[PDB]
Symmetry: C2
Subunit: 304 residues, 2 copies
């Protein structure tokens, strides 16, 4: 009923990019057309990796193959980590063409650039700032990426929501900072996540619903969390288009279930007191199917 075009990485083993996004979206009832931007044996956190990268021209070929068969029709577009400027520009062209075809198409974009250090070529920051974010409808940056895109440092929740207002102005009606260094009432081990949604009333007036979320931190390095998060947020905002509170509660709860099961099974696979390897920390995606289909609400968002 609802078709998503996901243009992301593919790994033979593991869950990142499309591997982390297609399965959940599929179990949540979405048809998914997947462009594997790369094919690697595993993600680059392993000691070794081998694979091939799809060229931008090759991406264009695949899109034109869908187009000439008149099956380039989508309700959503979903993207995440990209290392090549050409590739991201081609993605923006595809998004613009699709939105010209369907004005109600929702572009969900994780503007992957950095964290805490920027681990993407610097020439992509302008592209994300001036080309990608403007045509995005839902963006899931972390705090550092929100600062990069806005140009302003965030020292407070008030400043964070001012930056999120700037990002709203740049395009997306829904902005979720998924991770931040903001202090939490609950403790130092809770991370703060913020949500802002511009809701257009029939009055013609627009009101900004703002929400606060705090989640217990899992102290382990996971790969693909942003991709899973953006995919499930796509799903749950689709089901709750004017209730970002519930959409984010469900997304964060499913994430918590997935990460809890993953760390449990990783510690089991490794020895007690032993640090799980990157191979052992792969998101236990299939085993969380049920939790992804209907997540038990384990986090409550606070309306501001």
């Amino acid at each position: 009923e609802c078709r998503v075009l996901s243009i992301q990485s593919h790994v033979v083993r593991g869950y990142v990019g499309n591997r982390a996004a297609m399965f959940p979206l599929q179990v949540l009832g979405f048809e998914v057309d997947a462009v594997n931007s790369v094919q690697f044996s595993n993600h680059t956190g392993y000691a070794h990796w081998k694979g091939q990268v799809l060229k931008s021209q090759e991406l264009h070929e695949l899109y034109e193959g869908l187009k000439v068969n008149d099956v380039n029709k989508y309700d959503y577009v979903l993207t995440g980590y990209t290392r090549d400027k050409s590739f991201l520009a081609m993605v923006v062209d595809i998004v613009r063409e699709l939105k010209q075809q369907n004005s109600r198409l929702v572009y969900v974009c994780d503007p992957v650039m950095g964290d805490k250090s920027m681990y993407v070529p610097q020439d992509l920051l302008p592209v994300y700032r001036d080309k990608v974010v403007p045509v995005a409808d839902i963006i899931t940056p972390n705090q550092f990426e929100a600062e990069l895109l806005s140009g302003r440092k965030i020292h407070s929740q008030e400043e964070a929501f001012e930056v999120m207002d700037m990002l709203h102005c740049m395009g997306p009606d829904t902005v979720v900072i998924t991770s931040s260094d903001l202090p939490s009432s609950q403790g130092s081990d809770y991370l703060i996540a913020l949500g802002s949604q511009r809701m257009r009333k029939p009055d013609g007036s627009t009101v900004t619903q703002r929400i606060r979320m705090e989640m217990r931190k899992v102290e382990a390095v996971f790969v693909g969390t942003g991709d899973l998060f953006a995919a499930m947020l796509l799903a749950w905002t689709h089901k709750h288009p004017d209730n970002l509170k519930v959409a984010c509660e469900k997304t964060v709860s499913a994430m918590q279930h997935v990460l809890q099961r993953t760390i449990r099974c990783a510690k089991a696979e490794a020895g007690e007191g032993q640090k799980p390897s990157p191979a052992q920390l792969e998101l236990r995606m299939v085993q969380s199917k049920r939790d992804i289909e209907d997540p038990e609400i384990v986090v409550q968002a606070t309306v501001l």
Copy 2:
């Protein structure tokens, strides 16, 4: 707990090869490592298709990346459509190495070569028949050929159920302990609208002797061309024989019922998209797999096999 190495095609839209095999396997509780042997916009049944094919050396590089990380560990290997002799030979090398590392590894192979025109025709290079005969099938444990492929591999033509099972015995001799002829020209008890499928499994006895369990099944024929059916069938047969290792009857009943549910829903939705009385396009005939999730998880048994 169970990891399958699936080396098959990937399509951006649709369900063939890995697209048709990963999702059911994943939904049935299997971990899947997928080598996309190609990335096409869609399957070759469409009017057009664009993309790239993975080179045999590239397959080697990916497998070596898994190996050097010591994650070349698999309980199953699953393959289907391959058009390159070198790619198939590399698959055979990989399977041999894995079976040296794991003697219990189960190689599920759909020896895709051709089918029938109500006379037979191959849709793969002829150079693949020897490789499938002398290299692939000998290291396979479960093969799901149609009647045409069984005849090609055995060198005998099948004219009766008796001859079909003699050919399946020859295929057993060649290697695989489980042989399912998914499609056949054999006459059905219900008429021409039902198709015949056969199953044969060599069971090692507690005495050490070997006995062959044989089964017959009839399915309603669906009047439409579907792509990826063989891949979905091989995947779900892998899953259900893993659950039912010594009961080919129940495994095949579940697999064929899931196929029937998926195909029924697909043809219904395809006729809905198209007009009443209008032939559905290949794009409209894509297996409605997501919408069939639950039927794949626990299919309603709508077909019953007869043990011979």
